[PDB]
Design a protein around this ligand. Structure first.
Ligand code: HEM
Ligand SMILES: O=C1CN(CCCn2ccnc2)CCN1Cc1ccc(F)cc1
Length: 394
């Protein structure tokens, strides 16, 4: 006798477990147990993943309901689970979107300058270099300080919340509340700070005083700053880090992108498709009884949408484990989700990765791992899969 299959399967972000393809073929929706001890339906085919994400009867906001089966413990107040819905309801969705596009004047130049400065410092210090802690994460942090309009010098302290804030824990995390409350206080001060006139926080500070937003709560304005910083930083830094691993392990691709940098955006799209940065399936709670494949999901049950299930499904992406720059459906992956909750930072995230890679290949065309790949230490019980250090030589 064996216990019910447990998720997640592996914290390793450099290979997909052979188990995923077996499940997809035999039982593309099947029962699993989460770290909390709750039961859930794990969905692993492209067809079923899309079905779930496109049906709002599978609710994100209801995952925060008291008494619901949980993937993991809340690390924010339950209202913050509906963050984008609260933003929308306050009339702020267009303004937030506009602030977080990579089209702002000078933003791309800033990214390229920051990336080049980080790499120059690594070259000066000499090999081995840690591309996570000393490149990808500081590049993500600098980008989000600029996008938010907050001082660069404030980035590191906000960044140090994230190793706890994005934990995937069975139980509530006392440190997460301490850091949340502190970061909220910081963003509330930013909104009252007359020096802050650019970026997302500059725009929120203005809208706060406009009569059309006089009844929007101060709690929401501060929340938007904390959540967009955290979500953007953890996502872009984690994605770039694990994409660099995939690229480094493919010298032929590294050489092609070095030689033809106009292929970088197609490259990043394939790196997005094969990315294992999300450690857990995307959670949804059924609000009705809904047929998904061979299973009738009952109202109040938890469903987990496995992104790598969808993105390595050979029925949608033939030869799924291969990077192919000429697929006919290249942006049809689920790396940014799908439907109501599609990532509002998708363009910024693509641009962060494209620029980080372009700059790396120009400065370190011979970049290679400085340790055997099995020596990378993969962070556990976290909402992302990331190596603690990424040592490289060049
Ligand atoms: C490569 C980078 C990124 C990846 C791979 C990524 C991935 C995702 C995914 C898969 C979702 C869907 C979640 C769901 O449906 O449950 C999502 C939503 C979200 N992303 Fe990202 N993201 C990235 C960058 C960003 C950035 C830069 C920001 C903000 C600055 C951001 C903010 C958000 C927010 C606020 C949501 C929730 C949207 C909603 O609930 O309607 N992300 N992202
Ligand atoms: O606003 C969001 C959106 N998230 C969607 C999935 C994760 N993600 C992040 C980026 N792209 C996808 C869920 C979590 N929150 C709230 C939050 C933000 C920051 C923090 F530190 C703690 C909680």
């Amino acid at each position: 006798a064996t216990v019910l299959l447990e998720v997640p399967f592996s914290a390793r972000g450099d290979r997909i477990p052979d188990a995923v393809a077996e499940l997809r073929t035999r039982e593309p929706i099947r029962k699993v147990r989460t770290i909390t001890g709750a039961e859930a339906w794990l969905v692993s085919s492209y067809a079923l993943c899309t079905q779930v994400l496109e049906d709002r009867r599978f609710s994100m906001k209801e995952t925060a309901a008291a008494g619901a089966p949980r993937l993991n413990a809340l690390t924010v107040p339950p209202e913050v689970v509906n963050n984008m819905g609260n933003i929308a309801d306050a009339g702020l969705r267009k303004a937030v979107m506009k602030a977080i596009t990579p089209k702002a004047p000078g933003l791309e130049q800033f990214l390229r300058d920051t990336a080049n400065s980080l790499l120059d410092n690594l070259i000066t210090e000499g090999a081995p270099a840690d591309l996570r802690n000393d490149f990808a994460d500081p590049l993500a942090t600098a980008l989000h300080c600029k996008v938010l309009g907050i001082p660069q010098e404030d980035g590191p302290k906000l960044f140090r919340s994230l190793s706890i804030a994005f934990m995937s824990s069975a139980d509530p995390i006392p440190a997460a509340k301490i850091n949340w409350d502190r970061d909220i206080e910081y963003m509330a001060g930013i909104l009252e700070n007359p020096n802050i006139t650019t970026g997302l926080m500059g725009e929120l500070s203005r809208l706060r005083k406009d009569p059309a937003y006089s009844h929007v709560s101060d709690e929401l304005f501060a929340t938007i700053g904390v959540t967009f910083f955290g979500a953007g930083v953890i996502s872009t830094g984690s994605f770039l880090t694990t994409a660099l691993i995939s690229l480094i392990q493919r010298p032929q691709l590294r050489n092609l992108l070095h030689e033809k940098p106009e292929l970088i955006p197609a490259g990043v799209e394939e790196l997005l498709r094969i990315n294992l940065s999300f450690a857990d399936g995307l959670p949804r709670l059924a609000t009705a009884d809904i047929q998904v494949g061979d299973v009738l999901v009952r109202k109040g049950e938890l469903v987990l949408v496995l992104l790598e299930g969808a993105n390595f499904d050979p029925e949608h992406f033939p030869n799924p484990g291969s990077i192919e720059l000429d697929r006919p459906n290249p942006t049809s992956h689920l790396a940014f989700g799908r439907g109501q909750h599609f990532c509002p930072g998708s363009a910024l995230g693509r641009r962060h990765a494209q620029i980080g890679i372009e700059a790396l290949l120009k400065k370190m065309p011979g970049v290679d791992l400085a340790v055997p790949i099995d020596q990378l230490v993969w962070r556990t019980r976290f909402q992302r899969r990331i190596p603690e250090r990424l040592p490289v030589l060049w």
